[PDB]
Amino acid sequence: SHRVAFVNNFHMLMYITTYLGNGELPEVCINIYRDLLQHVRALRQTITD
């Protein structure tokens, strides 16, 4: 299942994203994680702007 999976959990998702970028290169997952983080940051900053 190349489709996106295991997205309901959110508390562990940020920890996994911030701990999986030390010495590993899981590009397929980190690209989606960074895109989601950027979208969330933009949505949050729209109100504050």
Binding site: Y19, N22, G23, E24
Partner: protein, 101 residues
């Protein structure tokens, strides 16, 4: 011994000694042949509790022997720097073989 009125008695020793699949199959095949009127009024909660505690004890006993082959293990939690003034705290990097066998 093997009285169906007290199914919770002849399961603890079987779970403790002879694995768990055989006592599980024996319990499944024995089921509830008799009605609720005979025996005791403990229903099945006590039997379930004794089965769970026996399974937990067996698993702990197995893990005690299984973990005796380890050498060392690191902790991923913070505040685990014996010498903070020497080098900054860093995480565990997986570069070596995950296991020997």
């Amino acid at each position: 011994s093997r009285v169906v009125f007290d199914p919770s008695n002849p399961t603890t020793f079987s779970v403790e000694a002879i694995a768990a699949y055989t006592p599980v199959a024996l319990i499944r095949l024995l089921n509830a042949s008799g009605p609720l009127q005979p025996g005791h009024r403990v229903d099945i909660a006590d039997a379930r509790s004794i089965y769970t505690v026996g399974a937990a004890a067996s698993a702990a006993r197995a893990r005690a022997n299984h973990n005796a082959n380890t050498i060392r293990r690191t902790a991923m939690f913070a505040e685990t720097d014996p010498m903070t003034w020497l080098r900054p705290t860093v995480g565990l990097k997986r570069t070596f073989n995950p296991r020997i066998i």
